[PDB]
């Protein structure tokens, strides 16, 4: 996260850190708890990931230093990537992780509401991007979960900013015209959380951008409202 500040413990209890153990254990991506055995994240996180056996989901984490060999995590039973996904820049950048065991909800770990279909017309003015990602292009994963408040950008304005890309309504952009605050390397897969009527909603999934927090280069997020039926198809399968 560029231009952000340290989160406080329990502030983003749906935020997870997804780790890979191959070749050595390290933070891979962010993710969000959406159900008691379900993590929503970005499909691009699994590039070259050949098996869910190398994955570890840690919830209730503020500091990466809380994670050692004796730290409890959730194993991943299954990786579900959207069928239409090719690459982050073309959209469908969404994946679900089916956990091997269930998350016990509490003040340190709980789910974030998915957006409502009727809320496709609501204007969100209180949106935050969170993660342990870089503070600039050439940096390192941060110990403390960072947060940055960022305004949503219309599809029309985002398209003007990304000449040569096709910015679809399945993407949602966020950033200041002058830049300064954004997601960066290591933040992808994490949430873009927006508070509306005192309830937090998972509006976006951190996906891609041209550099980090650059002037007139908003961050591009998977527009979660456009995938609610796909999420229910995969999580509510009979």
């Amino acid at each position: 996260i560029v231009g952000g500040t340290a989160s406080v413990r329990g502030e983003w209890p749906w935020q997870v850190t997804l780790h890979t153990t191959s070749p050595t254990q390290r933070h891979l991506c962010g993710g969000s708890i959406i159900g008691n055995q379900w993590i929503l994240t970005a499909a691009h996180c699994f590039y070259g990931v050949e098996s869910p056996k190398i994955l570890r989901v840690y919830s209730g984490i503020l500091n990466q230093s809380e994670i050692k060999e004796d730290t409890s995590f959730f194993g991943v039973q299954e990786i579900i990537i959207h069928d239409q996904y090719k690459m982050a820049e073309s959209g469908y950048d969404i994946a679900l992780l089916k956990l091997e065991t269930t998350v016990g909800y509490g003040d340190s770990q709980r789910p974030i509401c998915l957006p409502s279909k009727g809320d496709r017309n609501v204007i969100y003015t209180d949106c935050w991007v969170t993660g342990w990602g870089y503070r600039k292009l050439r940096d390192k994963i941060q110990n403390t979960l960072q947060k940055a408040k960022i305004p949503l950008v219309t599809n029309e304005e985002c398209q003007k900013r990304y000449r040569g890309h096709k910015i679809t309504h399945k993407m949602i952009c966020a950033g200041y015209r002058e830049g300064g605050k954004d997601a960066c390397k290591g933040d992808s897969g994490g949430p873009l959380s927006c508070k509306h009527n005192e309830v937090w909603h998972l509006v976006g999934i951190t996906s891609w951008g041209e550099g980090c927090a650059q002037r007139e280069r908003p961050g591009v997020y998977t527009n979660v409202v456009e995938y609610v039926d796909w999420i229910l198809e995969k999580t509510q399968a009979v």
Binding site: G35, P111, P115, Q236
Partner: peptide, 6 residues
Amino acid sequence: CTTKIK
């Protein structure tokens, strides 16, 4: 949440 996950 309005949208419910089982």
